[PDB]
């Protein structure tokens, strides 16, 4: 207390709170995961149905503006739409100077670094959301990256952000991740999205999928649980 | 509390309670109510009165022939808004010729509100906000919140006592999809009378409606076009 | 909500902060102008230059057209910049504009540096007023004040705080609707508000007079004397 | 409290800001300074919180020009600021002037720099004070500036912790007639008298203005004047 | 939580200019009537001293002939929006060779209005009355340092705005002729303000479809006196 | 239910109906309720109290109901 | 000593440098500790690479960063400010040899690292740096270097130096190995400094805990030394 209302006030001790608030906040939001097999990457997000109000895919939590990158967050959708606007603003303009494909790390490296910015000044606040890069390049990787408030970013096998991040942690613990490929990704990041708590206290929530793999030519496409229903199914095998 | 300066505080909650006391502030605006069906969005409003000599404020709003507005907040942002989705239609209009879909005009204004969110020296735009649009890709109801976040409702309401209303309009969604446009006016006009007192009732002074379809260019429906759909109106029992 | 920031509402709805520049003002010497049948006549007192304070560098007076000259009360600072502000704007606005200068416009001028230098933090208001004196109202003499709230007005005769406790209620006492019989009448009633002031001895009583026809004209010590004691006179044999 | 801002008054008539950052000055690694009939003399001392760093890596005493000594006791990033700034403001004197700076012209500049952080509550004025030494028209001369942004001259001073010692010392043995060598020998006796443990090589560096230029002790000659020190 | 505008109070409000509403009632109360037969304002003058100028107070105003004008505030940020409003009119004819219809003078002031945390201030303690007779028929509007505004068939804004507001209400209808309109804001400014009306305490305006020309009343409120 | 057994209510009476009125309230404020619709059956002087007793009830209970929401600022 | 506290730029009455060493806190935190050894034509640097998970990829949170071809990097802080402030020594590098065209030596780096540092510090407009700051390099026909660039602006060349949360217990135990003259040699030097380090944390390493930097007058490249390297290492020292 007192050290703690200004991102950029030192505590006496340790680093500023303004940071630590930030990653609890995101440490209370919706469920989003994202796992990677040998040459693709796939995500799976938790929402919450609202009210009927809703319109059954509104204010979704999946976006992909990247060849070959796709993005899912976890957090507050405010900050995630700002945050996915300047991914997609840093992405263009390395598009534009580079005239190539971005590597995902130094993409994530930038973004975070950007994040990281919107702490250091007393003027600006942390982000209250944390999400999840995913991408394939041809000519020297398969790649998964994880950025969060703090700007701080690091590279998953698999990682799990929201109210479930230990619990799913040990989800992805038990997948060997080394030599699986995205068709079994799917299911089980699926089948770990409904097994940790869908609906305990929660009244309900929808599932959505994100997936990208150098067997989509790179590039990301939203997996279509309208079609084959088959990781859906494999969730309820699991409810007994 | 400390933790109530500008919204570049964070919680220890993790919250920023300027961000709630927005979210109020959308509370503090009138009741309003928006629906649409397969073919058109209509939005309804109700038009806070002042005296006997003087005339309701207006809660209407309009951007661009395909899409229009309906408010709820301190009038002076709902209006900088207002005029902010106008200019962006306007440059739509001039790039390529090409009326602009909604759901990219209402992500502009979500990166715009929430801008503030984050810097300090400006509130964000605390305006509870009513979107109907139509677009070569689909026919759209929408909210926003000073949250700097939005959200597309087949049935929306937001406001004082809007929770009546908003139980109508979730008991009745699974009518309105392919209901003609008298009907969906007709639907809104009794999600309306669902927020009302019971001292006060419908009349052509303090309703307003706004109408946008794929054949049917948004036009704002006052007192003129209250008169005749107030026929039909569910009645007020016991 | 409290007084300490210039552009915070008092939860009344007041400004504390002008006030205050009012109240400034207020502890600042008498200062009185009224507009006779033609002429606007003015005097300064409570100068008390002693000894060896010299009462040139005092600046009793300052002109800042032809038509239309100021002193103001208060902080000399202010004074001094607002001085040089008018006398610019009116120089300038003069010069450049297809047609000359009116004492209106700069009135509204200086009326508008008030309330500029009053609208923001960071930027302390005047702490000064002034009685402002114009001679080309269609040749007619017209009388005005300023005030550090960046208000005007327009008065037969005006007076400020210290000044006007007294002053002040002396000439709505004493104000014939007809205009002072001729300048001489201007400076009898000009000597009589000073009479009213605090000390009336001449020492520091100064005075300046503008005909609204003629230009600014500047009154001796002599005159002034000669004056109040025609006035000490008028109110011996007013017995 | 009224430390709280520069920008504000004490009812005093004080700046209780500016005070504290010359307890800062006190804070520093106290300098020996003294002008004798040749020359100045700059003497200052180091110690290090261990014998791991390279001491020679760095170096406290810094010229401006070929013919200018300059010595602080403060905390050194804002010190190698300051330093660089004085070299570009002489390189700007230079390229003007087509003269290199005058001492008095360089000390009144550099102390209007250090004035220029003494305004508005987002800069920090400098925790440093400096001492300057340098050669014009055929004399020695040297002067102080401190964070107040002021300067004045001094034909004997020093200044750091424990520098009210170091004034004695100097008022009781400095007088205006000295020579060099016994002026460098003064330096490092107050020096030893300012600040406890062995004075060596290691410890203390000095630089010496000779009125053709500026130069200064190599380590071999720190080590042989410390030594036999009377 | 009352340093800025730009922070929300708990309840949603602002605590910064809830109070610039306050400044209203510091203000002399001011009437305002729109009729079928025309629009009239009435202004409470008070009068402070004999010396004054009794139209040196600006709380009427003309912005252009064919609508009128009526302040409740500081007359200093009244001055400022009165500028701002003769100049968007004239600029507004300049570039359109038309009269500036009333209620496009309501909306461009209030952009000014619209500035007191959003750019990059403070709101202005000023309340106004707008009266015009254009394409639109007879009009009166109010607004507020809030930036809200209003079309209205009659208001009263100032000190004691209340209850001439609630007796206006309860006389008033929105079908009268102008002059009962008039004849009941003067009864209300009588009895409110100090006295037995008279030109050197109150201030009458008014414009007519007509006559869009000269609201203002230079002695010819003798026929008030004289009537009321 | 609980409160209205002693009260001998009307049986055409929809608690259902009054749960959907009466949101964000309380237990104490729903006895509150019960109480003040016995009170408005015995200002009425009734014989016995109705659905309509209960709405007045409710609508006395709920809340300030608060002053114009548009002019607020 | 609290209260003025708060601001970077509001000196103490003691006029201390509370929050520079609250930068200093806030790099304790991180559980991690870092050396950097000169030796006689050598200079090597190692650092905990404590991973704190298997799921994430370990070549995703590396602390050893090359700056220059023949220049080498550590780290001990939060993760973002570590990589903002390698990028910028970077960016310093590269426009240092754009504008210069030769060498950028390890001393101009971080004395330019340092000086921007204070440049923070000296304005309250960002916070400072919270990360320290250790380099190798070699020089022109001289031999090796080893620096320390911290929050403080504080620079200087070190035979040996630490960095981390284990800072005075590395500090002694370099300071009881370098008061003998002999002959440090590579081995001997990243020898020293892995038992050094594997006291002060006095756990039994397990290769993927730790990350070696060396540069080398014999191979002036900076290299960062593979896992089998450092196993070789590792019996090299079990003797």
Redesign the interface.
């Known amino acids: 207390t007192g050290y703690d209302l200004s991102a950029s006030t030192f505590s006496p001790d340790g680093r500023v709170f303004q940071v630590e608030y930030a990653m609890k906040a995101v440490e209370n939001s919706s469920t989003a995961i994202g796992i990677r097999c040998k040459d693709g990457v796939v995500f799976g997000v938790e929402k919450l149905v609202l009210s009927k109000l809703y319109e059954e895919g509104s204010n979704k939590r999946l976006f992909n503006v990247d060849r070959h990158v796709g993005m899912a967050v976890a957090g507050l959708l405010a900050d995630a739409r700002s945050l996915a606007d300047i991914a997609r603003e840093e992405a263009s303009n390395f598009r534009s100077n580079f005239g190539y494909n971005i590597p995902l790390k130094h993409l994530a490296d930038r973004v975070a670094m950007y994040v990281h910015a919107y702490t250091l000044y007393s003027a600006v606040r942390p982000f209250g959301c944390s999400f999840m890069l995913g991408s394939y390049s041809v000519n020297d990787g398969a790649q998964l990256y994880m950025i969060d408030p703090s700007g701080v970013s690091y590279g998953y096998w698999g990682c799990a952000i929201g109210k479930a991040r230990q619990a799913a942690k040990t989800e992805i613990e038990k997948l060997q991740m080394k030599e699986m490929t995205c068709r079994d990704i799917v299911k089980e990041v699926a089948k770990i999205i409904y097994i940790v708590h869908d609906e305990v206290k929660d009244k309900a929530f929808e599932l959505e999928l994100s997936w990208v793999g150098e067997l989509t030519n790179g590039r990301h496409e939203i997996v279509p649980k309208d079609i084959r229903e088959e990781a859906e199914k494999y969730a309820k095998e699991s409810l007994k | 509390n400390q933790y109530?300066?500008?919204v570049t505080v964070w919680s220890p909650q993790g919250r920023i309670?300027?961000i709630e006391?927005?979210?109020?502030?959308?509370?503090?605006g009138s009741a309003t109510v928006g629906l649409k069906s397969k073919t058109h969005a209509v939005l309804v409003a109700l038009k806070r009165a002042?005296?006997?000599?003087?005339?309701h404020?207006k809660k209407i709003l309009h951007v661009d022939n395909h899409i229009g507005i309906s408010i709820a907040g301190?009038?002076?942002?709902a209006?900088?808004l207002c005029n902010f989705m106008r200019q962006e239609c306007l440059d739509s209009r001039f790039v390529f010729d090409r009326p602009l879909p909604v759901s990219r005009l209402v992500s502009l204004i979500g990166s715009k509100t929430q801008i503030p969110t984050q810097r300090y020296?400006?509130?964000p735009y605390?305006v509870g906000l009513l979107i109907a649009g139509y677009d070569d890709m689909g026919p759209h109801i929408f909210q926003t919140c000073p949250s700097a976040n939005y959200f597309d409702c087949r049935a929306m309401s937001i406001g004082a006592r809007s929770q009546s209303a908003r139980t109508y309009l979730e008991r009745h969604m699974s009518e309105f999809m392919e209901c003609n446009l008298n009907e969906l006016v007709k639907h809104g006009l009794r999600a309306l009378r669902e927020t009302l007192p019971a001292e006060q009732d419908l009349t052509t002074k303090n309703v307003s409606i706004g109408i946008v379809g794929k054949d049917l260019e948004f036009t704002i429906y006052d007192d003129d076009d209250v008169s005749p759909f107030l026929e039909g109106l569910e009645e007020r029992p016991q | 909500?409290?007084d300490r920031?210039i552009?915070?509402?008092?939860?009344?709805?007041?400004?504390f902060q002008v006030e205050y520049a009012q109240e400034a003002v207020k502890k600042g010497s008498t200062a009185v102008g009224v507009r006779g049948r033609d002429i606007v006549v003015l005097g300064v007192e409570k100068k008390s230059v002693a000894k060896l304070q010299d009462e040139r560098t005092v600046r009793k007076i300052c002109a800042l057209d032809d038509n239309v000259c100021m002193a103001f009360a208060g902080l000399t600072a202010d004074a001094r910049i607002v001085i040089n502000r008018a006398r610019v704007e009116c120089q300038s606005h003069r010069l450049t504009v297809e047609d000359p200068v009116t004492v209106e416009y700069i009135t509204r001028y200086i009326?508008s540096l008030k309330?500029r230098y009053?609208?923001?933090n960071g930027r302390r208001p005047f702490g000064i007023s002034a009685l402002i004196v114009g001679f080309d109202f269609d040749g007619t003499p017209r009388l005005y004040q300023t005030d550090p709230?960046?208000?005007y007005?327009?008065?037969?005769?005006?007076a400020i705080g210290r000044g006007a406790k007294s002053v002040?209620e002396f000439?709505?006492k004493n104000?014939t609707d007809e205009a002072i019989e001729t300048d001489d009448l201007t400076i009898k009633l000009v000597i009589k508000a000073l009479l009213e002031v605090v000390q009336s001895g001449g020492k520091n009583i100064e005075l300046a007079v503008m005909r609204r026809d003629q230009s600014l004209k500047i009154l001796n010590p002599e005159e002034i004397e000669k004056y109040v004691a025609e006035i000490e006179k008028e109110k011996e044999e007013n017995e | 409290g009224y430390s709280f801002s520069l920008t504000t008054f004490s009812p005093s008539g004080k700046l209780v800001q500016i005070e504290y950052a010359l307890a800062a000055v006190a804070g520093g690694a106290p300098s020996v300074g003294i002008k004798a009939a040749n020359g100045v003399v700059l003497a200052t001392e180091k110690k290090q919180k261990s014998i791991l760093y390279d001491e020679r890596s760095v170096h406290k005493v810094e010229p401006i020009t070929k013919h200018i000594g300059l010595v602080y006791s403060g905390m050194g990033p804002d010190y190698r600021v300051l330093v660089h700034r004085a070299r570009k403001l002489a390189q700007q004197y230079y390229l003007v002037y087509q003269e290199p700076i005058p001492t008095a012209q360089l000390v009144q500049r550099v102390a209007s720099v250090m004035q220029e952080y003494t305004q508005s509550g987002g800069v920090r004025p400098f925790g440093v004070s400096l001492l300057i030494c340098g050669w014009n028209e055929g004399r020695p001369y040297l002067f102080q500036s401190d964070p107040s942004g002021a300067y004045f001259a001094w034909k004997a001073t020093a200044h750091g912790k424990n520098y009210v010692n170091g004034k004695t010392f100097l008022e009781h043995h400095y007088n205006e007639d000295l020579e060099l060598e016994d002026a460098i020998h003064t330096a490092i006796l107050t020096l030893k008298e300012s600040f406890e443990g062995q004075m060596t090589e290691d410890n203390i560096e000095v630089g010496i203005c000779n009125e053709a230029g500026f130069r200064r002790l190599t380590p071999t000659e720190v080590k042989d004047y410390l030594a036999a020190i009377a | 939580?009352?340093?800025?505008?730009?922070?929300?109070?708990?309840?949603?409000?602002?605590?910064?200019?809830?109070?610039?509403?306050?400044?209203?009632?510091?203000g002399s109360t001011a009437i305002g009537i729109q009729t079928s037969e025309g629009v009239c304002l009435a202004v409470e003058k008070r009068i402070t001293?004999?010396?004054?100028?009794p139209?040196?107070?600006e709380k009427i105003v003309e912005i252009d002939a064919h609508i009128g004008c009526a302040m409740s505030g500081?007359?200093?940020?009244a001055?400022?929006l009165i500028d701002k409003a003769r100049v968007e009119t004239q600029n507004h004819w300049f570039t359109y060779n038309e009269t500036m219809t009333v209620e496009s003078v309501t909306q461009a002031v209030?952009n000014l209005?619209?500035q007191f945390?959003?750019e990059?201030?403070?709101?202005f303690?000023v309340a106004l009355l707008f009266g015009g007779v254009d394409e639109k028929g007879p009009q009166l509007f109010?607004m507020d340092?809030?930036?809200?505004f209003?079309?209205?068939?009659?208001?009263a804004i100032g000190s004691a705005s209340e209850g001439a507001?609630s007796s206006?209400?309860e006389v008033?209808?929105?079908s009268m002729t102008l002059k009962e309109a008039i004849k009941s804001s003067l009864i209300i400014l009588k009895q409110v303000m100090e006295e037995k009306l008279n030109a050197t305490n109150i201030e009458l305006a008014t414009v007519q479809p007509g006559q869009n020309f000269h609201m203002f009343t230079k002695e010819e409120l003798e026929e008030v006196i004289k009537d009321i | 239910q609980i409160h209205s057994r002693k009260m001998n209510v009307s049986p055409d009476v929809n608690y259902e109906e009054l749960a959907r009125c009466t949101d964000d309230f309380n237990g104490a404020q729903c006895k509150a309720v019960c109480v003040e619709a016995g009170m408005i059956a015995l200002r009425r002087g009734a014989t016995e109290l109705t659905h309509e007793d209960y709405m007045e009830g409710i609508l006395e209970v709920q809340a300030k109901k608060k002053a114009n929401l548009?002019?607020?600022? | 000593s609290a209260g003025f506290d708060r601001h970077i730029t509001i000196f103490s009455p003691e006029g201390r440098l509370y929050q520079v060493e609250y930068a200093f806190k806030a790099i304790n935190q991180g559980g991690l500790t870092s050396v950097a050894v000169r030796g006689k034509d050598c200079a090597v640097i190692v650092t905990q690479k404590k991973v704190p998970d298997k799921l994430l990829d370990s070549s995703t949170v590396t602390h050893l960063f090359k700056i220059t071809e023949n220049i080498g990097c550590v780290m001990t802080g939060m993760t973002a400010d570590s990589r903002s402030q390698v990028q910028r020594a970077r960016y310093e590098a590269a426009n240092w040899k754009y504008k210069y065209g030769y060498e950028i030596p390890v001393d101009m780096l971080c004395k330019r690292i340092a000086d921007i540092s204070q440049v923070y510090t000296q304005n309250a407009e960002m916070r400072p740096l919270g990360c320290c700051m250790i380099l190798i390099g070699i020089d022109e026909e001289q031999g090796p270097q080893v620096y320390k660039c911290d929050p403080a602006g504080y620079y200087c060349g070190f035979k040996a130096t630490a960095a981390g949360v284990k800072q005075t217990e590395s500090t002694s135990f370099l300071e009881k190995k370098v008061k003998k003259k002999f002959d440090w040699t590579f081995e001997q030097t990243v020898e020293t400094a892995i038992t050094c380090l594997s006291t002060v944390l006095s756990i039994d390493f397990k290769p993927s805990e730790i990350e070696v930097g060396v540069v080398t007058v014999e191979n002036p490249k900076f290299r960062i030394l593979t896992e089998a390297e450092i196993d070789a290492h590792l019996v090299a020292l079990a003797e």
Not at chain 2, 50 to 55: D, H, M
Not at chain 3, 7 to 15: A, C, R
Not at chain 5, 120 to 123: A, E, G, I
Request: proline content about 4%; aromatic content about 10%.
């Open positions: 109530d300066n500008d309670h300027q006391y927005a979210m109020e502030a959308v509370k503090q002042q005296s006997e000599l003087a005339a404020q301190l009038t002076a942002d209006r900088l020296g400006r509130r605390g | 909500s409290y920031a552009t915070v509402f008092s939860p009344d709805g007041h400004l009326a309330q009053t609208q923001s709230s960046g208000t007005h327009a008065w037969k005769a005006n002040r000439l709505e104000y | 939580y009352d340093r800025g505008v730009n922070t929300f109070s708990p309840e949603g409000r602002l605590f910064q200019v809830e109070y610039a509403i306050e400044a209203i009632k510091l001293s004999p010396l004054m100028e139209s040196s107070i500081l007359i200093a940020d001055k400022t209030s209005a619209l945390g959003e990059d201030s403070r709101p303690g109010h340092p809030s930036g809200t209003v079309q209205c068939d009659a208001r507001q206006l209400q008033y209808h929105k | 548009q002019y607020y600022a």
